[PDB]
From Swiss-Prot, chain C:
Transmembrane segments: none annotated. It is found in: Nucleus. It comes from Schizosaccharomyces pombe (strain 972 / ATCC 24843). This is DNA-directed RNA polymerase II subunit rpb1. DNA-dependent RNA polymerase catalyzes the transcription of DNA into RNA using the four ribonucleoside triphosphates as substrates. Largest and catalytic component of RNA polymerase II which synthesizes mRNA precursors and many functional non-coding RNAs. Forms the polymerase active center together with the second largest subunit. Pol II is the central component of the basal RNA polymerase II transcription machinery. It is composed of mobile elements that move relative to each other. The binding of ribonucleoside triphosphate to the RNA polymerase II transcribing complex probably involves a two-step mechanism. The initial binding seems to occur at the entry (E) site and involves a magnesium ion temporarily coordinated by three conserved aspartate residues of the two largest RNA Pol II subunits. The ribonucleoside triphosphate is transferred by a rotation to the nucleotide addition (A) site for pairing with the template DNA. The catalytic A site involves three conserved aspartate residues of the RNA Pol II largest subunit which permanently coordinate a second magnesium ion. Disulfide bonds: none annotated. Belongs to the RNA polymerase beta' chain family. The gene is rpb1.
UniProtKB/Swiss-Prot annotation, chain E:
InterPro entries: DNA-dir_RNA_pol-M_15_CS (IPR019761), Rpa12/Rpb9/Rpc10/TFS (IPR012164), Zn_ribbon_RPB9 (IPR001529), Zn_ribbon_RPB9_C (IPR034012), Znf_TFIIS (IPR001222). This is DNA-directed RNA polymerase II subunit RPB9. Keywords: DNA-directed RNA polymerase, Metal-binding, Nucleus, Transcription, Zinc, Zinc-finger. PROSITE patterns: RNA_POL_M_15KD (PS01030), ZF_TFIIS_1 (PS00466), ZF_TFIIS_2 (PS51133). The gene is rpb9. It comes from Schizosaccharomyces pombe (strain 972 / ATCC 24843). It holds the Pfam family Zn_ribbon_RPB9. Residues 52-72 are annotated as: Disordered. A zinc finger (TFIIS-type) spans 69-109. Zn(2+) 2 binds at C73, C76, C101, C104. DNA-dependent RNA polymerase catalyzes the transcription of DNA into RNA using the four ribonucleoside triphosphates as substrates. Component of RNA polymerase II which synthesizes mRNA precursors and many functional non-coding RNAs. Pol II is the central component of the basal RNA polymerase II transcription machinery. It is composed of mobile elements that move relative to each other. RPB9 is part of the upper jaw surrounding the central large cleft and thought to grab the incoming DNA template. Involved in the regulation of transcription elongation. GO terms for biological process: maintenance of transcriptional fidelity during transcription elongation by RNA polymerase II; transcription initiation at RNA polymerase II promoter; transcription-coupled nucleotide-excision repair. Residues 52-64 have a biased composition (Polar residues).
Swiss-Prot record, chain F:
Component of the RNA polymerase II (Pol II) complex consisting of 12 subunits. Signal peptide: none annotated. This is DNA-directed RNA polymerase II subunit rpb1. It is found in: Nucleus. It comes from Schizosaccharomyces pombe (strain 972 / ATCC 24843) (Fission yeast). The chain holds residues 1135 to 1186 of 1752 of the full protein. The C-terminal domain (CTD) serves as a platform for assembly of factors that regulate transcription initiation, elongation, termination and mRNA processing. Belongs to the RNA polymerase beta' chain family. The lineage of its organism: Eukaryota, Fungi, Dikarya, Ascomycota, Taphrinomycotina. It comes from the Eukaryota. The tandem 7 residues repeats in the C-terminal domain (CTD) can be highly phosphorylated. The phosphorylation activates Pol II. Phosphorylation occurs mainly at residues 'Ser-2' and 'Ser-5' of the heptapeptide repeat. The phosphorylation state is believed to result from the balanced action of site-specific CTD kinases and phosphatase, and a 'CTD code' that specifies the position of Pol II within the transcription cycle has been proposed.
Swiss-Prot record, chain G:
This is DNA-directed RNA polymerase II subunit RPB2. The binding of ribonucleoside triphosphate to the RNA polymerase II transcribing complex probably involves a two-step mechanism. The initial binding seems to occur at the entry (E) site and involves a magnesium ion coordinated by three conserved aspartate residues of the two largest RNA Pol II subunits. The chain holds residues 534 to 726 of 1210 of the full protein. Belongs to the RNA polymerase beta chain family. Coiled coil: none annotated. Component of the RNA polymerase II (Pol II) complex consisting of 12 subunits. It is found in: Nucleus. It comes from the Eukaryota. DNA-dependent RNA polymerase catalyzes the transcription of DNA into RNA using the four ribonucleoside triphosphates as substrates. Second largest component of RNA polymerase II which synthesizes mRNA precursors and many functional non-coding RNAs. Proposed to contribute to the polymerase catalytic activity and forms the polymerase active center together with the largest subunit. Pol II is the central component of the basal RNA polymerase II transcription machinery. It is composed of mobile elements that move relative to each other.
Amino acid sequence: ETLTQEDCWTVISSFFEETSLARQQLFSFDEFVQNTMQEIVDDDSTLTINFGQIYLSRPTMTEADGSTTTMFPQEARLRNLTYSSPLYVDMRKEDEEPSKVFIGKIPIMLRSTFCILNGVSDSELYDLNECPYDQGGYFIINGSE
Amino acid sequence: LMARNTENSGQTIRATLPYIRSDIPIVIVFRALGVVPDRDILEHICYDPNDFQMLEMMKPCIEEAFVIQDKDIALDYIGKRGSTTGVTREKRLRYAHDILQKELLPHITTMEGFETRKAFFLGYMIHRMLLCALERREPDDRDHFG
Amino acid sequence: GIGDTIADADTMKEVTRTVKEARRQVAECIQDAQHNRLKPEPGMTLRESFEA
Amino acid sequence: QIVEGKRIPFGFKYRTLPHFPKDDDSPESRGFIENSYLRGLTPQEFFFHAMA
Amino acid sequence: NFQYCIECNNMLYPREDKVDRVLRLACRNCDYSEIAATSKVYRHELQSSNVENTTVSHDASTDPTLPRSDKECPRCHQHEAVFYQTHSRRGDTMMTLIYVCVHCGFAFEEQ
Amino acid sequence: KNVQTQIEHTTLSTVTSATEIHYDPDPQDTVIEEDKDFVEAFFAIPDEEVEE
Amino acid sequence: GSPSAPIIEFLEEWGLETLEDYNPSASPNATKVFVNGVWLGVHRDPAHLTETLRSLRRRLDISAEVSIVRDIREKELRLFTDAGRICRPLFIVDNNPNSERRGELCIRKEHIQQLIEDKDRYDIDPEQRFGWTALVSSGLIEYLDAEEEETVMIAMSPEDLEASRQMQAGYEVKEELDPAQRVKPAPNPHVHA
């Protein structure tokens, strides 16, 4: 019972085991998402047409003479592709059921709660042409970080 | 606050209350919430004893409301948005109430029946001011950050 | 090299002596100017003529 | 070390930093190192130096 | 002292009693009129303090961030006592450094 | 010092505490609030023109 | 950021803490209470009110991002929570006194060895190798806001804390044994704990 300095590090190493660097960035976006945003659309969901909750959808791509295949960055990027996913808000006009209509697209931030990676093990990051050191924090809109 | 022109007058304090329009002495706004009668208004600012010094400064402040003088006029002296409109009273009154529920200290509460809450804050605000002109503390530090 | 930066061991004892021996010179100021026995002047003020 | 003609300024509150009492008008805290770039500088000091 | 007055609590204006020749306060709202309390009326004051007892460090003992003395708590009794000064903008408000015990609160001054 | 204190603003700088307003009917009214009063009475006693 | 609702639940409800009017003459003072600058409340003995809040952050019953303030010179007890605060994980002391005489350190070697049991991980479940993610759930390290500092008194190195504890009863300093090093400010100006 006294406590030595070499111990303090053995504590603050734990902090970087879980919290990691850039943790909040990166987290101030991991919460958007769902999140506080489904209530902000309800502050003005009126029109002499009502806005509902919004289905969460993973980042995909749709193109002519092609099909609906999700994105797999960074195998994207170079296709100068913007890395977003579609928003779908239930609209109310009355036929009991809503409408699930698409409302523009929102650019996702790499390595998030709702990203294409999140819980992916190191050995599996390579397969995808990624780098276990990347710590997210950025967007790849129009092909560039 | 003002305190210049040794000729005009006795160091009198005002307010702005965004986003329109000019300067509006303090008593005018207490009288626009639910506290028109004097004395009670000072209770929200200072607390006797008292300590007249900190209060005294009110003299010039109240004088600005020597015409208010109730609830009608108060809301009246608020016709200046703006882009040329109104006509005139009734309408003006409505705008005043709207302001008190969105503009006048927009946080706290934006409901309807909560004008007695925003009545103290102003007293609290101006409580601070008095502490500085009388030289009782020091102007907060914008350095923070903190 | 560093050696050119490391003052004599003996003669370094006498360094640390004349530094900690100037604490006592503040002690006789931090507490002696709490008994209003400065004093100050000129240029002012009293808190400043202490800092000085 | 200095700053605008006055040893390390106070604020926040009535203190140089949160590793000190209040009204600590002593060098052992307010910008003032005792060691050189050899030992050399102590945390509670290192910062004072960087901000000067 | 210049106060308000019953009925319609409001400001009180000064008013001499010529004929009689005495003090007498009143208001511009109603009519109420009470006698004076002292010859004094208004004071200037260029500034010479404004704390006296600055009531009342009643929150110093719980101020983990404050210094403390050692025995000698005039009156009451016990050891340990927190202190502190004032220093407000300008001065030179010397340093009437005061104190307060932890098991009481007697603003025991000192030279 | 003859000159040191022979070219200064001066004016009402010694009062700075200050100006008080008392209402006193008869030319022989006072109170206090302290001592004085006596001096005033002595000045009136010399009735050298009081009426004027 | 954390919801500004469930926060007043632990305030209006406890205690007593009364809103509405309560001003003419009595109360104040009687200190007040802001929250996100929203001064709804008067509250009396801040004493009980604070210690019991701070222990809500040590169990995590409330978001750990909440600051607390006790301006014993301007009254008031500001309580922020809106997003944009900055933190800084520290160690604490918790001095009642009660256990272990007076102080002192709030972690035990025990704790640490336990931490290392998770570096060797993974190898379990949740559970969950309590590696920091719990070192706050156990009231060991408090995150401090920038405005929370004002009311606090941190230490630099454990050595300084140990020396202060020894003085509280008179204990040699031993300054004639140290060798070329960062000459600290010895011993310790006042500051009992």
